[PDB]
Structure formats: structure tokens, C-alpha cells
Amino acid sequence: REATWVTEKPLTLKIHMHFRDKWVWDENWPVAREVARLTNVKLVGVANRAATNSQEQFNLMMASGQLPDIVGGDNLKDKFIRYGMEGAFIPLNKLIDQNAPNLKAFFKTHPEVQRAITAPDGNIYYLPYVPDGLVSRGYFIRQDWLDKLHLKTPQTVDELYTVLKAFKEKDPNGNGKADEIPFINRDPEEVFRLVNFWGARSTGSNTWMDFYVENGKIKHPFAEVAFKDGIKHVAQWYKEGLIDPEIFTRKARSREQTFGNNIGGMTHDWFASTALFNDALSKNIPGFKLVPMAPPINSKGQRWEEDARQIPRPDGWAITATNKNPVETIKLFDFYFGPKGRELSNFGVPGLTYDIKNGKPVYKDTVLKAAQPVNNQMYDIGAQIPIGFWQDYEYERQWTNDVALQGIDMYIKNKYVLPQFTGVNLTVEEREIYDKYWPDVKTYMFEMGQSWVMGTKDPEKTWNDYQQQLKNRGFYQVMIVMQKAYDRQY
Ligand SMILES: O=C(O)C1=C[C@H](O)[C@H](O)[C@H](O[C@H]2[C@H](O)[C@H](O)[C@H](O[C@H]3[C@H](O)[C@H](O)[C@@H](O)O[C@@H]3C(=O)O)O[C@@H]2C(=O)O)O1
Ligand SMILES: [Ca+2]
């Protein structure tokens, strides 16, 4: 028996959690085993580890008969609310009040977080991933390539064009081949964010393709004329090879590939793990120097950083109506919001990845000095995963090197980050419209965006058909409920 047990008799529950298009819940994970030991509840995964689309696996789950006990993963907020309101997920409000003292206290001190996860019917259908921190991404460029080519740090988009074209054409890696790829990115959606250079938004928050507000009016980035004109410019840089030809396909290991083989020039990504490549690659590429850059002055005369940490994220886990142990389940979930649960869910396992020293969790040198970023190392053992959990920025500070710190400090000091969208409070009827049309409109928008970047559709010529399709697919119906909600509120 342990003081932390949430049941005297051992309990096993089934969880469907497929996440990040790459991972599933693993009961053999060190963190899972530790939580199961401390709480007496073991979670067994039932998701398909061979699939590469987490959203489609949610959908396949929901269509494969009786639900498991718990469902978790990234980018599931809207599915948890839509299916909660229908009954597939249960409201957690009273379970929390009666049985989850850590969460009850957390929500009292984080009313914004409780607001963000509550549905139009007043119910909480999931517990979120709660990030910790302020900035997330920033621009990084190869200083050593700038110096090889005698180029200054670009300050405007026109200066940046010249620098990326030089990276492409002037052989900065010195191997006689035109193998350099000026701009790379782990995230396909960052290609859409390049429209910021031409004064257009791509998303209002860390959630991809989110709405934004301008002067009191709700807008969607992909519907705006500025997006049509901006995406033309992105398509031109893609045509000319300044953007990775594989930007929609290469994905998670883009940095390992392109910086590791000295062919990537620039990216837009999270400060800590991106700056770590200076340290990981120092033996193999002695003068490798990837450094933060201020955003270039864009066509609207401003230096935009569109992204920031979003507290909470639309990620987490929920209790299904078939779970026969909802009270033991909410107690298990509450364990993660207590001190020990929070330590494990962030740092891994004591004696394995960290030690308590002077009362604080301190990562081992083998973790801090490893070639893989520490968050990647955490995923592999079941930490830093998008369950309901409260991230602790102290985990990240320990592997935030001086290059990263000086980039984060620059961005915070100079206020590049744009105000983020914090959502609206829909009514039940407005929510019906949103759930009926929005998910499919966002899919269509992405498809058209990819077509525009790769040049298989010309944005100027297809823009009218596209706007008629937005109307036909319900987009303006959603825009109007969003605006009504905004107005009602504000
Ligand atoms: O890399 C960092 O320096 C960094 C520090 C923070 O502590 C987080 O660990 C942060 O993690 C983010 C990842 O870098 C990456 O952007 C990840 O993207 C996910 C996305 O959120 C979503 O789950 C889905 O689309 O899959 C993406 C992916 O992993 O394939 O988001 C992480 C985050 O915690 O938001 O990185
Ligand atoms: Ca070369």
C-alpha cells in the first residue's frame, strides 16, 4: 500500500491515446509504471501504433464500437466538447469537486484555464495539457553561413530574400554542390506562417489555423485577402527553392537531417530545442552557429512573432461514459496535479532521469548532454506527453542554453509577440454550427493552402472558387456565430 493509492484493490483501465501522429500510450513507459505503482491504477493502451494520423485514429476509435475507459491526445478539445455534449464523454465538474482536491485548487487559481476548457453547456469534458512559460518559437539563422558569405543579419523581408538566395546559390557549406536548403521546418504549418512576412496572419494562437481579432472583429487568417496575396509570395519562394521542397513531408526530424548534414540555413521553431543543435553538432560541424534572429520588418513595417505558449492547449484526456470507475479515474487524474505527480509527468523518474538535490529535481548529466533534445527524451519514457498535466518550466530551464536564453530574452524584451486569441464563449446553438462545419472547413483550408504553396493551384485564379466553397461549406455561418459570441461577451 502507498499513501497515494486511489484504490485499495488494483485497477486496470484501457486508454486510447494516439498523439503527434507518431506515438501511443505505452504501459511499459518508466513514467507510466511509476504512476501505476504510486496510485494502484494501471493504464493499458489500445491505440494503433502503426498509424500516422492521430485525428484519424480518434475518428476510427469512435467508429469501432465500445469506447475504452479514457481517451487522450493532442488537438482533441473540440472532439471532447462535441462528443461530451452528446454523451460519449462525461462531465467532470462534480467528480472534481468531490474527489480531486489538487485540480479543484488549480481551477480556483486558474479561472482562465477552467473557462477555456468548459463547454457551452457549462460542463468540463476533459482535463488539459497546461504549458508553462511565455514565448515558444523564434527565428533562427546560420550565423556561420552569414559570415562565410560576408552577409549582415537581414532586417527586412527584401534583405532576407537576398540572404536565402545566397545560401542557395553560393555554397556556404563549401562542398562544391548546390545542396543547401535555405529555410527548413519541422512543422508544415510554419510554411503558412511565412505569410507574416507580407503582413498577413496565419493563426491567432499556438493552435494551428486559429481565429484572431482585429479592432473588435473576429477574422480567420485563411479567408483574408492578405492571405491570398501573401501565399503568392510564399509560393514564389517555394518555386525558387528558398523553402524546403519537402516542407509538407519531411516533418519531425527536419532539424536532425538538415542541420546534421549542413544543408539547412534558417528555421522558425522553439528556442530551447532549436538552440541545442549548436551543442549537438559541435563535434561534427565545428563552426556550426545557429542563432536567434529578430523577425524581419515585414511589408506592414513591423517585426511580428505570431506564436506564443498557449495556456491551456487544446490537448488532454477525458473519461468516457463506458468507464465503470469514474471516481478512481478522476483521482488518478488528480494525482498529476499534486507535487509528486507533476514532478514525474515533467521530469521522468527519480534515479533514472533526474535526482532530487537540495529538494529540487535535477536532470542527470547524461540527459542534459545527450544529442537528443530533453523534451524528445521525455516523450520516449512517457513524460511531457499531452495528457491532462501541468508543465513545469523548471524542467525546460535546465536544458535552455545561453544561445536560447539570449533569444528568449530578446523576444520578451522587444515585445515581438502578437496578442494571442483567447477564444469566445459560444451558446449551445452557436456551438452546433461550429461543430457542424468548422472541422471540415479547416481541412479544406489546409488542402488549398498546400496547393497554393506547391503551385498546383494558382491562388489568384482559384480565389473566387475558394471563397464560394468557404460559403458553401459553412465558413461564414461559423464566422457569424463567432462574432455574435464575441460581441455578447465583449
Ligand atoms: O522544443 C522545445 O524547445 C520545446 C519546449 C517545451 O517545453 C515543449 O516541450 C515544446 O514542445 C512542443 C514541440 O516542440 C512541438 O512543437 C510539438 O508539436 C506537436 C503539436 O503540439 C501537436 O501535439 C501535434 O501537431 O504534434 C506536434 C509534434 O510534436 O509533432 O508541440 C510541443 C508542445 O508541447 O506544444 O517544445
Ligand atoms: Ca554546398
* Residue 20 near ligand 1, beta carbon < 6 Å: yes
Fold of the CATH domain 133-310+400-490? D-Maltodextrin-Binding Protein; domain 2 (3.40.190)
Measured CA to CA, the distance from residue 319 to residue 365 in angstroms comes to 38
Helix extents (H) in 175-318: 189-193, 225-239, 254-260, 271-280
Residues in a beta bridge with 156: 297
Measured CA to CA, the distance from residue 106 to residue 430 in angstroms comes to 29
Encode 400-426: b = buried (16+ Cβ within 10 Å), e = exposed.
Answer: beebbeebbebbeeeebbbebbebbeb
CATH of domain 1-132+311-399: 3.40.190.10
Nearest CA to ligand 1 atom 31: 20
- In contact, 448 and 466? CB cutoff 8 Å: yes
Measure Cα distances from 163 to 55, 70, 153, 156, 255 in Å.
Answer: 38, 50, 8, 11, 20
Domain residue limits, the chain: 1-132+311-399, 133-310+400-490
From the list 322, 326, 319, 320, the residue with the least C-alpha distance to 7 is: 326
From the list 87, 295, 273, the residue with the least C-alpha distance to 196 is: 295
Give the phi and the psi of residue 304 in degrees, each rounded to 5: -95, 130
DSSP string, 345-402: HHH--BTTTEEEETTEEEE-HHHHTSSS-HHHHHHTTT-S-SSSEE--HHHHHTT--H
Question: In terms of DSSP bridges, do strands 127-130 and 389-390 run parallel, antiparallel, or are they unpaired?
Answer: parallel
At what resolution in Å was this solved? 1.4
Measured CA to CA, the distance from residue 183 to residue 181 in angstroms comes to 6
CB-based contacts of 52, cutoff 8 Å, min separation 6: 21, 22
* Residue 396 near ligand 1, beta carbon < 6 Å: yes
* Residue 252 near ligand 1, beta carbon < 6 Å: yes
Angle made by CA atoms 434, 439, 444, in degrees to the nearest 5: 125
Ligand 1 atom showing the smallest separation from residue 132 Cα: 7
Q: Which value, to the nearest 10 degrees, does the dihedral of the CA atoms of residues 232, 191, 442, 461 take?
A: 10
Helix extents (H) in 196-315: 225-239, 254-260, 271-280
Helix extents (H) in 63-218: 77-86, 93-99, 101-109, 111-117, 143-148, 157-169, 189-193
**DSSP code, position 115:** H
Torsion 257-260-263-267 (CA) sign: positive
Q: Is 472 exposed, middle or buried (0-12, 13-18, 19+ CB in 10 A)?
A: exposed
Q: Is 55 exposed, middle or buried (0-12, 13-18, 19+ CB in 10 A)?
A: middle
Count of CB atoms within 10 A of residue 61's CB? 17
Q: Is residue 435 marked as binding?
A: no
Measured CA to CA, the distance from residue 155 to residue 141 in angstroms comes to 12
Measured CA to CA, the distance from residue 203 to residue 314 in angstroms comes to 14
**CATH topology identical between 1-132+311-399 and 133-310+400-490:** yes
Q: Which helix (H) or strand (E) holds 250?
A: none
For 283, the grid coordinates are: 563535434
For 259, the grid coordinates are: 542541420
* Residue 134 near ligand 1, beta carbon < 6 Å: no
For 200, the grid coordinates are: 498577413
Cis? peptide before 91, omega within 30° of 0: no
Nearest CA to ligand 1 atom 18: 20
User: What is the 172 CA–ligand 2 centroid distance (Å)?
Assistant: 6
- In contact, 247 and 188? CB cutoff 8 Å: yes
CB-based contacts of 240, cutoff 8 Å, min separation 6: 165, 168
Measure Cα distances from 319 to 10, 86, 131, 209 in Å.
Answer: 19, 14, 21, 27
Measure Cα distances from 417 to 133, 205, 275 in Å.
Answer: 13, 10, 19
CB-based contacts of 56, cutoff 8 Å, min separation 6: none
Q: Which of 18, 53, 57, 74 has most ligand 1 atoms within 8 Å of its beta carbon, as the pocket-test mutant? A: 74
Angle made by CA atoms 115, 99, 86, in degrees to the nearest 5: 50
For 281, the grid coordinates are: 553538432
Measured CA to CA, the distance from residue 192 to residue 205 in angstroms comes to 14
Say which experimental method was used: X-ray
- In contact, 304 and 411? CB cutoff 8 Å: no
- 349, amino acid identity: V
Residues in a beta bridge with 318: 71
Q: Which helix (H) or strand (E) holds 12?
A: strand 11-19
- In contact, 12 and 44? CB cutoff 8 Å: yes
From the list 14, 21, 77, 25, the residue with the least C-alpha distance to 383 is: 25
Residues in a beta bridge with 362: 355
Measured CA to CA, the distance from residue 480 to residue 199 in angstroms comes to 24
Count of all residues that appear for the chain in the document: 490
Count of CB atoms within 10 A of residue 348's CB? 28
Q: Which helix (H) or strand (E) holds 9?
A: none
Nearest CA to ligand 1 atom 28: 20
Measured CA to CA, the distance from residue 148 to residue 167 in angstroms comes to 10
User: What is the 179 CA–ligand 2 centroid distance (Å)?
Assistant: 5
Give the phi and the psi of residue 147 in degrees, each rounded to 5: -70, -35
Count of CB atoms within 10 A of residue 137's CB? 23
- 353, amino acid identity: T
- In contact, 259 and 277? CB cutoff 8 Å: yes
Residues in a beta bridge with 214: 217
User: What is the 313 CA–ligand 1 centroid distance (Å)?
Assistant: 11
Q: Is 330 exposed, middle or buried (0-12, 13-18, 19+ CB in 10 A)?
A: buried
From the list 207, 187, 321, 167, the residue with the least C-alpha distance to 251 is: 187
* Residue 190 near ligand 1, beta carbon < 6 Å: no
- 156, amino acid identity: T
- In contact, 43 and 15? CB cutoff 8 Å: yes
- The residue numbers preceding gaps of C to N over 2.5 A in the chain are none
3-state secondary structure 410-460: HHHHHCCECCCCCCCCCCHHHHHHHHHHHHHHHHHHHHHHHHHHHCCCCHH
Residues in a beta bridge with 13: 43
Measured CA to CA, the distance from residue 288 to residue 285 in angstroms comes to 5
Helix extents (H) in 1-62: 30-39, 54-62
**DSSP code, position 202:** S
- In contact, 74 and 315? CB cutoff 8 Å: yes
Measured CA to CA, the distance from residue 55 to residue 208 in angstroms comes to 14
Q: Which helix (H) or strand (E) holds 141?
A: strand 137-142
Task: Give SS3 for 64.
Answer: coil
User: What is the 177 CA–ligand 1 centroid distance (Å)?
Assistant: 33
Q: Is 197 exposed, middle or buried (0-12, 13-18, 19+ CB in 10 A)?
A: buried
From the list 393, 136, 138, the residue with the least C-alpha distance to 266 is: 138
- In contact, 276 and 399? CB cutoff 8 Å: yes
- In contact, 238 and 191? CB cutoff 8 Å: yes
User: What is the 473 CA–ligand 1 centroid distance (Å)?
Assistant: 31
Measured CA to CA, the distance from residue 221 to residue 31 in angstroms comes to 39
* Residue 375 near ligand 1, beta carbon < 6 Å: yes
